[model samples]
Target chain A: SGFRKMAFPSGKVEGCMVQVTCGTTTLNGLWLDDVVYCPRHVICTSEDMLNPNYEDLLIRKSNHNFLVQAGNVQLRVIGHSMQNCVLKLKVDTANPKTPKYKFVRIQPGQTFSVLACYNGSPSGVYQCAMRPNFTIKGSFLNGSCGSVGFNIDYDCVSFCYMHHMELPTGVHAGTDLEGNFYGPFVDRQTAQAAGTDTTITVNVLAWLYAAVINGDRWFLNRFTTTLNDFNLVAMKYNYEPLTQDHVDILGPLSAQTGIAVLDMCASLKELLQNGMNGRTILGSALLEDEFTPFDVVRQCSGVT
Target chain B: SGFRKMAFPSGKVEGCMVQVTCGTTTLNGLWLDDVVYCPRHVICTSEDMLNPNYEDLLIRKSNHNFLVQAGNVQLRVIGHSMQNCVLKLKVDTANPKTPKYKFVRIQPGQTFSVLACYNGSPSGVYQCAMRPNFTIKGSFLNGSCGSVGFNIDYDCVSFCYMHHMELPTGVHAGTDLEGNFYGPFVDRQTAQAAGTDTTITVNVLAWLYAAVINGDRWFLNRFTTTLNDFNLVAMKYNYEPLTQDHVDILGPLSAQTGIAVLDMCASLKELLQNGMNGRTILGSALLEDEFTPFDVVRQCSGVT
Candidate 1:
């Protein structure tokens, strides 16, 4: 009974196709929601001539009525109301078993078109479902156009993407030690002379960064969080010396004008990703905003 | 009676003449105070030519003695008792007014002969004084072996010296005023550019030097203590707005690798003359026993 099964040649229906002869200025909200539900033009279609009304040429949807009469086919979807409904035509429906979901919705009365080499007939059961914004249809009957009983639940593949290292989990060697080791102030000359580059040494550059920030713990913490391969040993240990090793890392780097800045921004980005945790958006806002010397202090010093 | 009116040949002193001699043994004690004393010779004057002694002459004098052959005239110094003599010589006394302080103070018992110079002549009364410790001597009576009386009352021109600077009371323009002014931390970059090299600018460099030091009092006291003929209110102040007046005296100075260091050192020397108070030897000890980095800080901060 549900299969009045008329093969609609064109894949989509226009929101106004039914209104073409409705004899009224504007209809119920169903027609309005239909206008909202239309699927976007498919980008990768083979020939531009074949996919009529492509998005680039047809930005103003209200101006160009969705209903089109091409060849012997006059396509129209006659649904009253559907959730986020958008129209798209099935192509190469040769394989009847594959499930396809529209990227956007197809509304009733929205006459849409698709490139097709179907059974060479202007007849196939109409398949529909929610897509792009929302709506799902065409779930049963194995690609059957009228199989309206299908549903799907989707999930995102990844939650992260980065061009640099994420924040380190912990800091380098703990800052507390006895004997010869003392203070966050690293003697750069000594470390340079010794020819040793270690976590403590790297702490020199880090400490410069810290000193530039002037005891701003939140800034430093966020800054550290944004860097990758930062010897976590320096951060974890409060006594971890700010050494020549650190200077060796940062000295040449500071010579580079924007390297520290970019690194600082990256650190801020990392902190932002980690739920911001009441961490002010200041650093991130700066990284994302137009930079100035005053902003340099804000990021470097972590002052708002 | 002290200085005889009798005149001898220009070069001779009774039977003795001036000749060079070298010390031979490890003489002991011998302090050459105001008393011009000599050491025992490995070399002494003979009737012939000069000689050289390569022996390492050592001295262990607690109350040292000098080798001497006094002229036929006897000398009894009225005041001094030689305690620790160094290089003592009996000057010629044939002509009583002008005496020569001899070169060699030979130990009498060391050796018979080792002459240094030949055909040298001696002069008049060679009465010397007692002053090996803290004392200063004024103009010597040329060839006269006069005494510097060892009395604290007669303050001798002592040999102790140090480098010191007596800065003028206030500062004046070096070049002229032309500088970019930073208004406040609330608006550092918003400053108007004014300072020039022909005129000194007051930006970060000046801020680092003056205002920052005096707790950000914007009123400039002076450029520096030293001033020149070129200094003129029409030229220095130039009647330009504060933003357009102060010059960039030290700015371009740092550009040259070679001269910049010298200039900075000079500026430092100038600042030192103005800043460092008290007598300083200005040696490594200046850096060694000094408490600074703060003055440097204040100066850089632009304090008065």
Candidate 2:
């Protein structure tokens, strides 16, 4: 493909081109200094990258949405010291007065996730991605910091869009053009037109069950927040908790799916309360230890 | 003097004795055949002491109410590895069927504080101390764990109680019997009935300001939880917020104290919201950098 004229949400224009040889290219590669450069979310968007090409997977561009499936993503920034550092995700070259995101000496383990767009039930990373270049660039600053960017345990995953989807906290599953393959993505619709009128397909209850099994308060709170919002928005005027409306709206699937979501919320609360009382019950302890005993999580997508 | 009979909240009865030399002593010090075992919150209240006496100040008994003033208190549990461990705060010996408290896998950095008793505003530790030997017993279990119990940076402080007092999370400020120095404790009523009708004198606002200055999420959440409860209890039937009711209830001090408390809540909200918006506002940044520029905090107790 030839270098087509590209436009960014920042109202800035550039000639960009990319070849499909490798994964994750803007496909708008251009020649600079007689060298081809088809950047990811960085490079063209970063002001400092002109003088520096930080070639490490350690620092993810602010624009890329990385859904953390497993492992700690924070280890990429915080090394042995676990010391605090200032991280700036700036995409202000066009309007360089202010940065895209500023964290006040954040710890590496801290989640940078904001509200989730999936019915606002749980938190998702880069919820503000609609903002110009928010998903476009990022950088970390610490004098003692080095190229020690590593978080191999981070099983970061992205999704292909076919319909509405909601992920748990610590997840960033969204549209991933690079993950393109004939990989049997039932939900992977490459074009927006193909996603028309499609219902959500993610198994949120199953994911929440996983969070409870893992037994993390942050994860629990985020999942509950997301589910609570889902109930509110989807059932708005026609809603009463513990009612059959969920069964009706849940479509074809037995009432089990809807009640399972509610059960997870109550179970999460029970887990926290039991924890305070120095007790670990079914949701936290039993399920935790007996997790892989069987084929536990199953999909309940109400897709027609 | 000699060993005498002393009673604990557990009511198990112990021959507790103490000398005035040490600030904390169970006045009923009993001679264990040869040695005088006048203990603070430990030795006497422990079953392991009969089999073992853990002498390191590093490990605190479950029975003592230690108020944290400054410094991280969690380091005593998690060391260099930052490894997780099972900590048992047990006191069911008399009823030995069940342990007092159980944490699944607690991190050293996590706060173990529960709800505060001060009008239910902030959080207070040992809230369950009255649960027999709860303040009297505790232990940690880890294979990789060692005698390496060190949290020297733990500036753990206890408070002398006079009237209504509440402390933030990461603090265990409670009645300190040994701190019975000639040092002024305008509120330190050594005995429960030394005086009555004493209003709370702790400058909770100042403490919250300190938490903000320190900039920690756990600390912020605890302080706000405490303050919210205080407002609910203190102004029960005659409260609507932002009214001159605070000034009246605040005794002679200007309305600044009450409003300042409310201001902290709003400021805390502002800080968190601003952080999400890629901005650090006045409460988090301005006062953070200029903390000691002037005489900032002053106390106001409604005690007449």
Candidate 3:
């Protein structure tokens, strides 16, 4: 009966059809959540507005809507009723099984944003629950988000994402620690010839990606998240690295980049699986909404 | 006198030089700050420290060194008489005709860290103030620090450096602003035969640089500034925005990988002048200290 109507009620639903996990659990709730829910476009309608049996709850915005308690937190919509605009929140975690719960409710004007940082078995933070005009621009989500009070710290950490990493002048590039060929960030494998190490040393090349959303109204309040491999252990650029092996922050992903909220996570387990697959989708005109512009958040160095 | 003596006291002094700037100002802090100071080799001893006079400043663990203010803020090392392991802080600025003042006097087993965010006219933050523990990576600069009325709510922003931006899909073989039939994160220019429309589309690519330090410690903190026309005007990726006729948020740079402190800023001004030059520097082993590991900070979606 729950499978009767499976589709994003209003805006459309879309993403890669891959099963991503942050360790054993599914959603780290920054970048991974979106990737997981990605394949299931029916994430919204798949919920029951009238159900009282499920812990993960959702109540569609009508002339009004109300909250109901299950085991998990509840999601509600108020502002102006977005016809077919059904709000939903997904919380994934390493919680004994109580995955962190998150909600997405939209209005016509405001651009919603969130910041969650949890660096545990999985690890990041959410300042959204604290301040309204909060900015999560400089924080990273390489780990997990929360069970709150456990590992949560108002997400406030700024780090760098390699636009490119050059191998030290003499560092050679062959196989990585786990017998994998170089990089998810830099790979000169194919570019290198039969002998000479044209592995492109000092100067390098790394791949970049963006939040891939599927909707016609890019004009709509944008929603998108990010992915970062913040795996800093550079004694050997490609030595133990070259294979993402740290935090796997997941989700805050939206099939419809709608009244959006987004973020990222870490973990090589997830990256090694989905790192190269649908990267092209990320290269699209990015759509995460901002309360301000790129310059305003980080004066000098961060992505725009 | 400033040019007569040049050397960093306590720790060590090092970096690169190519007469860089944030528009007309030289050595814009963050990453650029380090870059400009790089070539001089001696930024501390070379300064007019004791030459300046200010009020209410205290003395360090010194029982000996006397106070003498001449030009800017004064500096000295007294605790445990750290003659060989002395320390100094450099605070540089493009003060039209004056530079910012600085003061440094610390002991061993001490830790120092700073957080400054100024995003107006000349955009960016912080000076190399504070102490270092340098042991077991303990006495951390970790998950602990913030400011109130700081207007700095969170740090979750990460923009795509131009160098990371892939030129739009069907844009072509570099003929122009559409790019240098390239591999660099910089390519959007032109002037040639049958100059058809290769105007850059959705994809973006900007140049990258770093804090080129001189410690056999190629593994120091990375101090790299930025150069990106964080220009966001979407209509057609290029048919209109190729000349980088947009914003470039510039200022400060560093390259000593990990002596201490960091970040970035820039603009079209910087990008245009040297879009094709020294881009090779960015491709090396990255340097940049972490208050915490990359995973703890961003979770999953940033460079390690």
Candidate 4:
């Protein structure tokens, strides 16, 4: 078995090699340093040891003005001060450049909730924020912004491998090899290399439906723009020589898949119009079979 | 002199060259017809005299959902029914196709005012409808819809000339010579004859500000799209071709003056975004010192 490599953060690990015969399950031997560690070492070396706490999950400022909690499809803010204030929530699930915003007024003891994800399940951590008087305030229960409660299965080798690195979240972040950074990925790959067999499939239709219900106009725009941009790329490549230029510009999905998504988007617009009149009542059953209701905990959980 | 043509639904008048002495203002002693009329005849002929009832100011189903009374900027609905009912009002000043609607429940003797126009002023007559589902009520103080108390300066020659036609409201109607069914216009020369000096000037910027205040998203979209379309035309014909294309696309303005109206629409999107957040407070003075307000009468003045 090939030895998985890991690196120490600083001069934390003293003499890095260890001979261990304590456990019968130990393969080859084990390795140790200042913080003793072992992972069925075939042959432990300084280069092969994994780094300890080199990368922490550091959250950059969220682009949106709100944050979604784990179980809830909605984002929320609890008013702490007795003073009246208007909360402006803006969200962009796809691209941060263009976002859609909704304004809600919050008085004392009012818990304002924003239905950010229509279907009640946003795929990953999205960019969001809540601004009062255009100034960042202490309304969020957590530290400003980041996803809470919601969880996705990272059992797939590719998902774990890509996410293990501190890479910015995107659909195709892990696919590019040269762009790979050192992380727990190197340690895990020795046992199982990332492959398509166990890759998690995304339900694009569910996402489209959610976007519509949540009023995520920006996400819809980006999905369409990406499709358009990729079509342009295909046209240019068809007429000219295919080069590196074409590679970076390729969309995450195939042309047929892109068309399918676009068609789904077009159909959703018709559905939206039908519901605009008061006569058309849209219930949860129309959106999904097992619908998660959006509710917020009224109590200010962690506000000062 | 040849008589001006007069064709009736029941019968067409035959040629009559009679000397008519109606008043001293008569230019060339006019002749009289079966349906006699006097307007200081100046050699009236079947081909020359203007239509008497012909020039009647018919309230053509206005291109807009509601025509503002000359004074009031707000669109209103007065209740006449003793029974309670709900009134729903929906208008999209931008794109009539996709408009936002609001529903209001009214009690007996209640006069419901639709703040349809956010700031109480809309650019043009928009596509709108008010439906009551509670009772078989004959309510609207007026039969259906027309201006009552409001007024605008219709003294402008261009305003009367363009509106005089029974042209179903749209961007470019009479400008199409082949499509021109005569109300007054005979050929291309007649239309070409209308120019900037007599062209109806649009308060384009005010309309935009009104839309933003009223939250008319569809109107904003159409306004931008029209601007985009004209720019495409401008690009195709850099100069002279641009001029003719500009003429046909005259937007309620004289053909030559259409270009000037088109130029005004091009500079408003930036201003729109600046006021998106509450941080941006738009003052009335910012809209325009000289503003035109859109008002519609609740009375159905003439509906057959």
Candidate 5:
């Protein structure tokens, strides 16, 4: 009977779930703490798990009710509430594990606009509902928010995702040696006008190769994650898939571009690895036998 | 008078031709000066004249002789002498006006090898001959070094000539803004293997464009001159002319490859050009009103 009825007009009950009846209202999903606790999406929670009054569960607002709005690359949850409440944001569905959320508590009279998508994410069908801080029952467990299926509208000319790999450790991803952050985004207009994606990926790949050759290591670390995000968003929502044919063409291209960088790095690595602590060459003989005119003619002739 | 009869064991003769007999040696190109004077191509005496022997006018050497050699891209005046004779080197048929020269005197009992090519030059048929400080009759009078056509054997692989130009004043040509000497060279083996000069000039031009975009004014200043040197050397001897057909092909290729660099430079130039002095805002609204994620995503991504 510790799980049974709320006993004694108590100041606090410490821990454990219990049913409390106050006047005509009875709460079932209430935690027996000193503070009164009403679970998310619950009105009078005196009953069992499945059945609850739908009208009582609804909350009123002086302005418009909170709703999710999707942008070309992000999602925003906007609305006003009569009471201060915490909301949860989701993409796939109202499942506990899949939805990524944050407690955006707003004041009763104030309006709210929360970024429902992940940081810097450009994809997801974002949905928002009251956060179940106490108990997930009724509409919360049944996957029913006041409004459902809030999808972020994907509309862009082109999208590019890059995955850089096979690098030595200690280097950050997505930046070059010069510390300029570099990444890829394509021109949707160009791709559509060309009627093909032939050059889109190739163009992005070429840039990647250039940055890598310039010693930008960050791209290698985050490219896969970015690609998966773009792919998941496009395939799941837009029914579009960025192709891999361009990737097939890059093997030989990469080798050719990498030769100069590899040669330079090898020489540098060798010099440092060998340790230039004690090397001396005070004078070397000018082998007159081997000295040629090409050595004397200054490249910048008269300017000097 | 003073113009006739080799004139009175000359102390100082103002002008006009003269003659003198020195121990069965008839000297024609002789100028008797008040100051100690030395005649070119003459074994002894100080003099000035417009006439001298063409053959017996020669000086003897224990070694074979001193001569000039011209290769496809360079000029070398070679040989050995007992006395350290001050020789002036020149190219083409020596004339009073054209071929530039300087004293290339070699010490007695020492070998000589002077590079007669311009700095950063890649041209010429290079013909070296003795420069008569005095004078010689016939072909020499008409500005020619007697049968002195010493063509250095055109051997070796490739020749690179760079003409850096269009630079800011005070900056020297033949080097970039970073002072790394930049130029063009063609691999003979590679060019021939390709059966054409397809990519050689293109590569050079591409480098030129890069340096220009990088504000390397030096190369732009001398590129034309360098191209001429390479052209002259190739056409004068090898009868090979580097073509521009490949250059024609680069217009389209530039559009393709320049997608990244062009875009980046344009944006960078913009921000710096506009006076957007640094200032931070406190709790500014997320310009969702004007925000576009594509605007923030950089290109040349993961492939780097």
Candidate 6:
């Protein structure tokens, strides 16, 4: 048996040899440290190891956020507070500077939602750059200066005063379906209404939420602007959504698999066309086609 | 005024360097390429043109998938197909790559009953791969070979055959007080009867009428080796579940979203647990307290 060398994390285990005794007769010994052979040792690969899932359902301060997954987990914003500046979200999966995670121009007061649900799909992470920043307009005097940074965690959410509410106006709504409702948007007029501040001048943000989700490239082309100076507000989100609860339970499974599915009723149109033609009987209460689901969804949009 | 040179894709239409007249009034005009402008032609950035109203529900694939105003869109995967061995989904608002609509693998044939009412989630497109084909194991032989290249069109599916048979060694008898059915496994003399195949594999799959919900992934991990190589014909799956029909309706959405859903109560469990409640409300309704939903599934697997 040939002898070999081995090293341990604390220190190198010098030429420790292994000898086999046959009928009390010793044979050539080998270095056991270099060639470890366990009676029942199972080696686990990255694939074999259990996946560490993350919750896409979370709340953070100021709508600025970060997504944490198995090997990559860290968020830092490099910018000033309460200003229209940009921040960088870097993930150090391995070494630094290589930038495992990279994003540009993350603005302040933006409600950010980052999903690390790369399950069963790809084994990769994402970074955003030249993204947009949330813009809040208002008056704050009494020497009350607030801090600023991008999304602090998974669910970046914060509320500004009535003068400057977090989350954008147009993107926010109040759905009162099933009478389960309570939101910043009481009504269209109130939700969309604007207030005043002392320094009436608008702030120029380097990054914005629109620049991120919609992507800076697309947004720039769509708006036909150099994107030199602009301010944007983050999104307003309800911390408590019936769906959010489910997300907590199912979030861990997000990073496990990545297959897509289709339904028998291919489209909504097909489903609506097929009424309960007595095929499915609900005993005394038969299938009633009185209500159309699509119509109901539109009504909540406050559109005609 | 300084005469600056300019170029245009459709040839130059520059100002002339000669005297000009507006409304019969002679004026010193800067003429060049067949046209002239006054010494002073002020260009202003149109505020009206700069102003753009952002809608909350911006780019929606449909009613189910729409972008909210906060630069985010929540979508429910409705349907999709794949072509690569593994799909690579992307949010390419600008530059995209080849087969941008690839998806991760979803396991096949397990507890797939909870995807019926799956909704309110984000999803991605699915493409197929060429190598490592998905084949089906049928009665005593490897049924059909899977496709070589990716299924680009996204309308593919696969199926499996089911097997069951009844033994003759069981006895039967009528119930007593409640007049319900009972006593079939008691008699010993009725043993040693012959048996034949029961439900077709297609019949077993029909239980999974709905496609895999969109965005959500399902794969065949636990029974991969088992499904591919079974000695007994009863162990083989009549059809290879490698098509679109096999996938539940969970398709991907556009950019700026982070959620997807799957139906959990859509399977044979509903059928088996239909009746058999303590008093039997609907014939074979909910089974005894001894058997929960999970037990119901086990009972079905144990069918002789």
Question: Distance (Å) between predicted and true CA of B255, model 3?
Answer: 33
DockQ of 4: 0.01
DockQ of candidate 2 compared with the true complex: 0.01
Q: Candidate 4: where are CA atoms >4 Å away?
A: A1-304, B1-202, B208-304
Q: How displaced is residue A198 in candidate 3, in Å? A: 21
Task: State the displacement of the C-alpha of residue B57, model 6, in Å, after optimal TM-score superposition.
Answer: 37
Model 6 segments more than 4 A misplaced = A1-74, A77-304, B1-304
For candidate 6, write residues A1-304 as lDDT tens digits.
Answer: 0000100000001111122121222211111212211100011122321331111111112212322122222222222111111112222222221111112232221222111111101110111111111233211111111111111111222111111112232222211111111232231123244232111111111111111111222112112111121111101111111123322322222222211001111111121234223222111111111111211121111111
Model 4 vs. true fold: TM: 0.16
- What are the per-model numbers of colliding residue pairs? 120, 40, 138, 44, 31, 112
Q: Which of the two candidates, 5 or 6, achieves a greater lDDT against the reference?
A: 5
Evaluated on the second chain alone, the candidates' TM-scores are: 0.17, 0.21, 0.15, 0.19, 0.17, 0.15
Question: Candidate 5 overall Cα lDDT vs. reference?
Answer: 0.21
User: lDDT per residue, candidate 4, A1-304, as tens digits?
Assistant: 0000001010001011122211121111101111111122212232433542212211212223123222222323221111111111222222111112211222111111111111112111111111111111111111111101111111110111111111111111110112232221332223322222110002223333333432333323333324354344334322122233322222232232343444443343443334222221111112111111111000001000
Report how large a share of the reference interface contacts model 2 reproduces.
0.00
Per-residue lDDT of candidate 4, residues B1-304 (tens digit): 0000000100000011112121221111101111111111112233432442222221221223222221122222221111111011222222111112222222211121110011111111111111111111111110111100011121110100001111111111111111222123331212222111111112324344333433333323334335556445334422111233332333433222232344444433433334233221121212221122121111101000
Across residues B189-233, which tens digit of lDDT does each residue of candidate 2 receive?
122222121111122233344443323233234334345544454
Considering every candidate listed, which one attains the maximal TM-score?
2
As a whole number from 0 to 100, the lDDT of residue A226 in candidate 1 is 27
Question: Model 5: per-residue lDDT, tens digit, B1-304?
Answer: 0000000100011110122122222222111111111112323222312233323344443112222222122222232221212122222332222121222222111111111112111111111111111000101111111111111111111111111211211111121111122222111111211112111223333333332332332212211233344455434332223445433433443453453323322322232234112311111111011111111111111000
Tens digits of per-residue lDDT, candidate 3, B1-304, equal 0000000110000010012122111221112221111111111121322331111111221323322111233223132111111112232322222212222232211112222111101111111111122111111011110100000102211110101011222121111111121222121122222222322211111112121221122222233332233234222222223232211211111221211221222222233233323222222221112211111112223221
lDDT of 3 by residue, A1-304 (tens): 0000000000000000112232222212212232122111112221331222222322232312322112233222232211121112232322232223333222111121221222212111111111121111122222212111111112221111110112333122211111122222122212322222221111110111122221122122222223223224122223122222111111112222222221222222233234323222212121112211111112112210
lDDT of each: 0.22, 0.21, 0.19, 0.20, 0.21, 0.18
What is the lDDT for B62 in model 4? 26
Range of the 10 consecutive residues with the lowest summed lDDT in candidate 5 chain A:
A1-10
Decreasing lDDT order of the candidates: 1, 2, 5, 4, 3, 6
Using DockQ as the measure, which candidate wins? 3
User: Every model's Cα RMSD, please?
Assistant: 41.8, 22.0, 25.6, 29.5, 37.2, 31.0
